[PDB]
Structures are given as C-alpha cells and as structure tokens.
C-alpha cells in the first residue's frame, strides 16, 4: 500500500547539501570582525 | 464471517518501515544548523 | 470503472510549481535581517 | 488549476523594499555611539 | 446555476482594508522600544 | 461587511501613551550612573 | 427570529473585567527585576 | 459567567512577596566586592 | 401538544454548574508555571 | 479490550537511552570554548 | 431490556490504567533535555 516518497530525499538532500554553503558563507563574514576585533586592541595598547 | 485483512499489515509495515528513513533523513539535516550554530559563537567570542 | 483524474495533477503541478516562487520570495526578505543583523554588531564593537 | 498569486509579490516587494529604509534608519543611530565612543578616549588619554 | 457571492468580497474588503489599520497600530508601538532601546546605550557608554 | 475595530485604537493609545511613562521612568534611573560615573573620576585624578 | 444572547456579554464582561486583574498582577512582579536590575549596577560601578 | 481567580493573586502575592527576599539576598553579596574593591586600592596607593 | 422538557434544564444546570469546577480546577494548575516562570528570571538576572 | 503497547516503551527506551549519548556528545564540545575562553585571558592580562 | 456492558469498564480500566504507564514513560525521557538543557548553560557562562 505504498506511496512513492522517492522524491522526498531527492528534494531534501539538495536542501541539506545547500545548507553547508550558506553555512560556509557566513563564516567568511564573521572572521572580519574577529581579525579587526583585536588589531584595534594593538593600537589602543601602544 | 471474516474479511481478509492480510493485505493491511502487509501495506502498513512497508509504511511504518519507511517512516524511519524519512525520520532519519531529516536528522542529517538538522545537525547542520547545530554545528554551525555555535562555531559562529566561537568567532563572536574571540 | 475509471473517473478521469487527469485534471488533478494538471492542477497541482501548477500549485506545487508555484510554491517554489513564494518560497523563493521570502528568502529574499529574510537575508535583509541577516546582513543588517551583524553590521549593527560591528558598530557596537568598535 | 491556478490560483492568482499576483498580489503576493506585489505585497512583499513593498515589504522588502521598506526593510531597507528601517535598515538605513538604524545605521544613522549607531554611528552616534561610534564617534562619541572614541572622542571620549582622546580626552581620557591627554 | 449561480449563487450570488457579491456579498463575499464586499465583506472581505472591509476585512482586508481593516487589517492595515491594526497593522499600522502596532508599528506605532514597536518603535517605542526601538528608540528607548539605544538611548539607554548612550548613557551606559558614557 | 465591517467589524467594529473602534475598541482597538482605543486600547492601544492607552498602551502607547503608557509607554512614554515607563520610557521616562528609566531615564531618571540611568542618569544616576552617569553623574556618579565621573565624580568618581575627579577623586581618582586628584 | 432571535436567539437570546443576553448571557453572552454578561459572561464576557466578567471575563474582560477579570483580565485587568491578572494584567495588574504581573506588573507587580516585573518591577522586581526592574529595580533589582540596576541597584546591581550601582555596586558594580563603585 | 465568572471563573474564580481568587487563587491567582493569592498565589502571586506570595510570589512577589518572595522576590524581595531573594532581591535582598543578593545585595548582601554584592557589597563584599564593593568594600574589598577599594581597600585594595589603599594598599596599592601607599 | 407539549412534550415535557423539564428534565432538560434539570440536566444541563448540573452540567453548566459542573463546568465552573473544572474551570476552577485548571486555574490552580496554570499559576504554577506563572510563579515559577519568573522566579527563574530572578536567579538568571543576578 | 486491550491493544498491545509493549512495543511502545520498547521503542522509547532505546530513544531516551540514546538521548544521553548525544547529550554527552555536545558537552565534550562545549568545554573547548570554556578552556580556550580564558587562556586567552591570561595572555591578554600579562 | 438490558444489554450486558460489564465487559466495557472491564476493558477500559485496563486501558486507562495502562495510560499512566506510558504517561510515566515519557516523563523519564523529557527530564534528560531538562538537566542537559542548563548544564550546557554553565559551561557557556564561565
């Protein structure tokens, strides 16, 4: 009495495979405040 | 005065056996926001 | 003893094809709070 | 078997077009603590 | 074989026309926590 | 096909009128750390 | 062809009259974290 | 059409009456870092 | 040509009289999450 | 008139027994930001 | 003109007596996310 859910994991693996990209997209943005967060602190210290 | 419901559990066990797959399919997607949820928090903290 | 359900999938494929548009319509709105969510955090940090 | 979703993107583009204004409205407020954040630091240093 | 649904859109346009008011009613309330959200931050900073 | 929303703005104007009070209530508290924030700094300087 | 809804507003006015009490009951609780929220900040500042 | 909310304020007044105790409990702890915060500063100054 | 409905309101007044009890039974349960909802917030704040 | 729910607790005890593992899996990850959270603070202090 | 419903409550009391077990079965599972919900918060705080 099945119903074909073959399209389901075919849909979501494109979804969950996409989520690593937009995961990796933000990490390249957060390090900008990381590096600039403390080279400010050098110039304040000296 | 029976009516043969042998096809019924033969239908649903394929159903309820299938539901663990699509259950397990989503868990591989939710951990992506779990791991990326807090390695963001490292770079914000430092 | 059939009944013609050819109009059914002809109806829903226009439906489920439409749902990606309004799916894609909201993603262009949610990134506005994403980008503005952390360029606030730059100006707070400095 | 369509349903007219022409009003939808007509609604949200006014929404997502509005969100840049209130995005731009806050940036004019956050720079006030940015500039006053460090001209305090001049008078403390001297 | 019609049934007169002229009263329907006559009913809902008064509804959907009303929803912009109570939409606009809350926006005048949310900006109170917006402006007071950061003039707190001035007095904390100095 | 109206529904009487006269009670709505009658409710919220009492709300948004109240929010200036509790807005003004906190400003009288934040200046205490403002004035005492720097008369400490006089006694440290001398 | 009426149906007597005199019991209705007789029921809800006791309801909406009650809701101001439990409205006023919580405000006496939220000010406890308000006052203690910043007398902590005095002792941290000095 | 009432529902007896006499137990409500009977519950919360024990709550909001309790919150002054745990409010007053922490103030006896914060003054320890207040007094020891500056008798350190005497011994550093001399 | 009557039919004796004297048993009807004799039945329902026991019903609607009972519904205030089970109405009042739940209110004694909901205040438990009300009081414990914010004495958590004291200990988080300090 | 029973229905055999022996498979139920047999299912969930494997579930709730599993949840301690993935509970314990994350604690080994959160201590990494705990220890590195303050050995940063040593090198900043000296 | 009775019909023997003695088997009915004999059936359901085994049912409603069973429902406390599977009620009590889940509570032993929900506390796992309760305790691990906040010992995460200790390690984040320090």
């Amino acid at each position: 009495g099945v119903i074909d859910t073959s399209a389901v994991e075919s849909a979501i693996t494109d979804g969950q495979g996409d989520m690593k990209a937009i995961g990796g997209y933000i990490v390249g943005a957060l390090v900008i405040l990381a590096v600039a967060g403390l080279i400010y602190s050098m110039l304040r210290k000296a």
Side-chain angles (χ1 to χ4, degrees), chain A residues 28-40:
Chain A
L30 289 175
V31 298
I32 310 298
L33 60 90
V35 181
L38 81 156
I39 61 99
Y40 295 169

Side-chain angles (χ1 to χ4, degrees), chain A residues 13-45:
Chain A
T13 307
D14 300 332
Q16 65 187 351
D18 182 74
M19 296 178 77
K20 289 185 179 184
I22 50 182
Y25 286 160
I26 304 301
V27 181
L30 289 175
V31 298
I32 310 298
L33 60 90
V35 181
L38 81 156
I39 61 99
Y40 295 169
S41 299
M42 179 70 76
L43 272 298
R44 294 182 184 274
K45 178 176 85 271

